[PDB]
From Swiss-Prot, chain A:
GO terms for molecular function: mRNA 5'-UTR binding; RNA binding; structural constituent of ribosome. Keywords: Cytoplasm, Diamond-Blackfan anemia, Isopeptide bond, Phosphoprotein, Ribonucleoprotein, Ribosomal protein, Ubl conjugation. This is Large ribosomal subunit protein uL24. Belongs to the universal ribosomal protein uL24 family. Residues 1-21 are annotated as: Disordered. It is found in: Cytoplasm. Ufmylated by UFL1 in response to endoplasmic reticulum stress, promoting reticulophagy of endoplasmic reticulum sheets. SUPFAM superfamilies: Translation proteins SH3-like domain. Component of the large ribosomal subunit. Interacts with DHX33. The keyword Transit peptide does not apply. GO terms for biological process: cellular response to gamma radiation; cellular response to UV; cytoplasmic translation; DNA damage response, signal transduction by p53 class mediator; positive regulation of DNA damage response, signal transduction by p53 class mediator; positive regulation of intrinsic apoptotic signaling pathway in response to DNA damage by p53 class mediator; positive regulation of translation; regulation of translation involved in cellular response to UV. The keyword Phosphoprotein applies. It comes from the Eukaryota. The gene is RPL26.
Swiss-Prot record, chain B:
The chain holds residues 268 to 321 of 427 of the full protein. Component of the large ribosomal subunit. The ribosome is a large ribonucleoprotein complex responsible for the synthesis of proteins in the cell. It comes from Homo sapiens (Human). The modification Phosphoserine is found at residues 23, 28. Signal peptide: none annotated. This is Large ribosomal subunit protein uL4. Citrullinated by PADI4. Component of the large ribosomal subunit. May bind IPO9 with low affinity. Interacts with RBM3. Belongs to the universal ribosomal protein uL4 family. The modification Citrulline is found at residue 33.
From Swiss-Prot, chain C:
This is Large ribosomal subunit protein eL28. One of its GO terms (molecular function) is RNA binding. There is a cross-link at residues 57, 64 (Glycyl lysine isopeptide (Lys-Gly) (interchain with G-Cter in SUMO2)). One of its GO terms (cellular component) is dendrite. The lineage of its organism: Eukaryota, Metazoa, Chordata, Craniata, Vertebrata. Belongs to the eukaryotic ribosomal protein eL28 family. It is found in: Cytoplasm. Component of the large ribosomal subunit. The modification Phosphoserine is found at residue 114. It comes from Homo sapiens. Signal peptide: none annotated.
Length: 129, 54, 125, 158
RNA sequence: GGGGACCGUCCCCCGACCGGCGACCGGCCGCCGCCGGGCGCAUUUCCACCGCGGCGG
RNA sequence: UUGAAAAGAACUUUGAAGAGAGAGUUCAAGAGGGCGCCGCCCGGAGGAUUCAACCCGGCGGCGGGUCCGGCCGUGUCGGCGGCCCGGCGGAUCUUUCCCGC
RNA sequence: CAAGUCCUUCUGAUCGAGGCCCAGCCCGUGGACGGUGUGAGGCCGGU
RNA sequence: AACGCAGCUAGCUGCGAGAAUUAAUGUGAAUUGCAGGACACAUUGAUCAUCGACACUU
C-alpha cells in the first residue's frame, strides 16, 4: 500500500505520464535487467539500456540463447533493435523487430566513463543496507 | 454487574430472552405436563358416495 | 445456542446456495446438504457427518465432542470405516442408536454412507 | 457463567495464563441492529457527485412556434452547422439537460445514535465468539484452538 | 480549600449454608459403542457370476 | 478503436484504370489503411485380509449421592482486606485533628 | 536503494495452470499503481 | 490581436529576424517520417528537462 499523499495511484494519471514522457525520463523506463554474472559482479539488478550492449531475448517468438547487440534505441516506440531480431518483408527486404527492454537480459555492458560511475554508485548503495 | 470505566455512562444491554434454547424449554416436564395430547391424525377429504345407489 | 445461531445463519451464510428454486447448504458435516435446523453441522452441540476416506476405500465417520464446543481444533474426532458395506451400515447404526447420539440422523447417515460406497466401486460401461 | 479461556504463546500452544471471558462476548446478537448501523455508517465516507449545473444550457434556443410542421421543443438559433435547428434544453433531446440534475447538497451522510452504534459493536463482538457463525462467514477455522483467540503481548513488539 | 467517618456500590480474601455439576472442566471406577492389532480359517462371514428363478418398489 | 508487431499484401495474370483472379503476411484478412432396475430370499458353479465370541491398546457417549478435585448461582461470617496493604460515587456528616481571612 | 523471468506445462505471444527441503520458492517497514505480445509482489519504473 | 520562423511543413504546437530556438545548470548517447548533420561522451557532450543570463517584429 502506498502512503505518500503526493504520489497518485490513478490509472489514467499514471498512463498519461508514461505515454507522454520526455526522452531523458524515457531512458529510465528504458531499463533492462543484467544477467546473473553481471548482477553478482556489479551488485546491480537493473540498468538503463544503451545503444551498444550485448542483449539476449528471453520472451516472445524470438526468445532464445543467442547473444546480440543493440543497434537502435527507439525511445518514441519504447522498443530497441538487435541484429538477428528480424523478419522477412513481403518485397524481399529485411526489417528489425522492436523488442521491449524489459523482456531482455544484458549480457555485457558498454563499459564507459559515465557507465563505470553508474554501476559503482548503485553498487555502493547495496552495502548501505 | 459494573458499568464501563472508559465510557462514563455505558452499561451493557440486557437480554429479552435469558434462555434462548427452545428445545431445552419445550421438552421439559413443567411445560409438557400442561399440554394437551397432539392430534397427529390426518383427515383427508372424504369422497361423498351417493346413498340410494350405494 | 442452536436456535439462536440458526436464526442468524438462516438466510445469510457463506454455505448457502439459492438457485433454480432450490436451496442447498455446503458446511462440511451436513447430511443431505440441505438448509435446515435439523441438518446443520455447525450450530448443534452434537453433530454427525460421513465423508469418503482420503483414498477411495471406505468412509470417515466424524462426530462432535461434547466438551470442546469453542475449540474447533479438538472439537471433532474422526474414525475411518473400511469393512464390508453391510458391516459399515451396521457399525454406523450402532454409533447413533446405541450411543443415543442424535437418533434422528440415523436413517440419514446410512443413506449417505450407501451412496458413498457406490461411488468407490468401479462403474461399468 | 463466563468460562476461563487461555492465552497462547507465539509458538501456538497455551502458555498457562488464563483470562476470564469478558462479559461483552455474551451480549445479545442482533444482526438487524448491526445491519442497520452498518448500512447507515457506510454512507459517511462517500464523496459527493453531481453534473455541471450549466450542462445543456449554453445554447440560447427557441421553440420555433407551432405553425411549422415540427415539435414544439426549443431549437438552436442560427444556421450553417449541424447544431442549427436541433432540439435542446430537454431530457429527451440529444445534448440536453438530464431530468432533475443531481445536486451536491444531497443528504449523503447519516447520523446514528451513539447507544445504537455501540450496541452493534457488542453484538458484533459476541457473534465473533461463536465458531458456527465464524464458519458461516467462511473464515476457515477448523484447526485453531479456543475460537476467541488471545495471544501474548510479545506479538505487539514484532 | 485538606484529611477522616458514614452511606451506596462494585473489586477482593477468608471462612461456614443450601442448590447444581448446568449446555464452564478434568481424575477415577461402571455400562455401551467404535477403531487398530492378536486368536478364531470354515454348516461362519464376504465378494463376483449365472438362472427365459420368488417376493416388494 | 487495424494488428502483439506493418509483418500494410513480393511476384504471376485480365483490364487504360478503378477494379479483380491466383499467391503471400498473421492465431486470425471471417482484422486489408474511417480496417474489433434394486433390496431381500432360493438354487448352482466358484474365489477370499474374511464371521461371531474372546485378549490387548486407543478413542468416544451416558451415569456417579458429590465418587475426588476444580468449580457455578446464592444468601451469610469476622467488618476480614481500602482509598499512603489497594477502587468508584454521594445535594450524608464533619476540621468540634486541617493548606485560605 | 528487496525479491523467480527457477522447473514442467497453455498460447501467436503470455503476466495463465501445477511444483517449489524446513508447514510450507524469495523479499516484504516494499502484496498501491502503470508499462511490458492475456491476467505480474519478485521483468522494468516505482511502492 | 496580426504577421512571420523548420532541409523537406498545411493545421496543431513552440518560437520572434539570435524566430519548432541562444546561453547556463542538471542529465548523459540520441532525434526520427525521410535524408543529412551529429556523436574522444573529460584535453568535456547528442537528446531531454530545468531555467536565474541574453534576446523578444507590428
Amino acid at each position: 500500500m502506498k502512503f505518500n499523499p503526493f504520489v497518485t495511484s490513478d490509472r489514467s494519471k499514471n498512463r498519461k505520464r508514461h505515454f507522454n514522457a520526455p526522452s531523458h525520463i524515457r531512458r529510465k523506463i528504458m531499463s533492462s535487467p543484467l544477467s546473473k554474472e553481471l548482477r553478482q559482479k556489479y551488485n546491480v539488478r537493473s540498468m538503463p539500456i544503451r545503444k551498444d550492449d550485448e542483449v539476449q531475448v528471453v520472451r516472445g517468438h524470438y526468445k532464445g540463447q543467442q547473444i546480440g547487440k543493440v543497434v537502435q534505441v527507439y525511445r518514441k516506440k519504447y522498443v530497441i533493435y538487435i541484429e538477428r531480431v528480424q523478419r522477412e518483408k513481403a518485397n524481399g527486404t529485411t526489417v528489425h523487430v522492436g523488442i521491449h527492454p524489459s523482456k531482455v537480459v544484458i549480457t555485457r555492458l558498454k563499459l564507459d566513463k559515465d557507465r563505470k560511475k553508474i554501476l559503482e554508485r548503485k553498487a555502493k548503495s547495496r552495502q548501505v543496507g | 454487574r459494573k458499568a464501563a470505566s472508559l465510557k462514563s455512562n455505558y452499561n451493557l444491554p440486557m437480554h429479552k430472552m435469558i434462555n434462548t434454547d427452545l428445545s431445552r424449554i419445550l421438552k421439559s416436564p413443567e411445560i409438557q405436563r400442561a399440554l394437551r395430547a397432539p392430534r397427529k391424525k390426518i383427515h383427508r377429504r372424504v369422497l361423498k358416495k351417493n346413498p340410494l345407489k350405494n | 445456542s442452536a436456535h439462536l445461531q440458526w436464526m442468524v445463519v438462516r438466510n445469510c451464510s457463506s454455505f448457502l446456495i439459492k438457485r433454480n428454486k432450490q436451496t442447498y447448504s455446503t458446511e462440511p458435516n451436513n447430511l443431505k446438504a440441505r438448509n435446515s435446523f435439523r441438518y446443520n453441522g455447525l450450530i448443534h452441540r452434537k453433530t454427525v457427518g460421513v465423508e469418503p476416506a482420503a483414498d477411495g476405500k471406505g468412509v470417515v465417520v466424524v462426530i462432535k465432542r461434547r466438551s470442546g464446543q469453542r475449540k474447533p481444533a479438538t472439537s471433532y474426532v474422526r474414525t475411518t470405516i473400511n469393512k464390508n458395506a453391510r458391516a459399515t451400515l451396521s457399525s454406523i447404526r450402532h454409533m447413533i442408536r446405541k450411543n443415543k447420539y442424535r437418533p434422528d440422523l440415523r436413517m440419514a447417515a446410512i443413506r449417505r454412507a450407501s451412496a458413498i460406497l457406490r461411488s468407490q466401486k468401479p462403474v461399468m460401461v | 457463567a463466563r468460562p476461563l479461556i487461555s492465552v497462547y504463546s507465539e509458538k501456538g500452544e497455551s502458555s498457562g495464563k488464563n483470562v476470564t471471558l469478558p462479559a461483552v462476548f455474551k451480549a445479545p446478537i442482533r444482526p438487524d441492529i448491526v445491519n442497520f448501523v452498518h448500512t447507515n455508517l457506510r454512507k459517511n465516507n462517500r464523496q459527493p457527485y453531481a453534473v455541471s449545473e450549466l450542462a445543456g444550457h449554453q445554447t440560447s434556443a427557441e421553440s420555433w412556434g407551432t405553425g411549422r410542421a415540427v415539435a414544439r421543443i426549443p431549437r438552436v438559433r442560427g444556421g450553417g452547422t449541424h447544431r442549427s435547428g436541433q432540439g435542446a434544453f430537454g431530457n429527451m433531446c440529444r445534448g440536453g439537460r438530464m431530468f432533475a440534475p443531481t445536486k451536491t447538497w444531497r443528504r449523503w451522510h447519516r447520523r446514528v445514535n451513539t447507544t445504537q452504534k455501540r450496541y452493534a459493536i457488542c453484538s458484533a463482538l459476541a457473534a465473533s465468539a461463536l465458531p458456527a457463525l465464524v464458519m458461516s462467514k467462511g473464515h476457515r477455522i477448523e484447526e485453531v484452538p479456543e475460537l476467541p483467540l488471545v495471544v501474548e503481548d510479545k506479538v505487539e513488539g514484532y
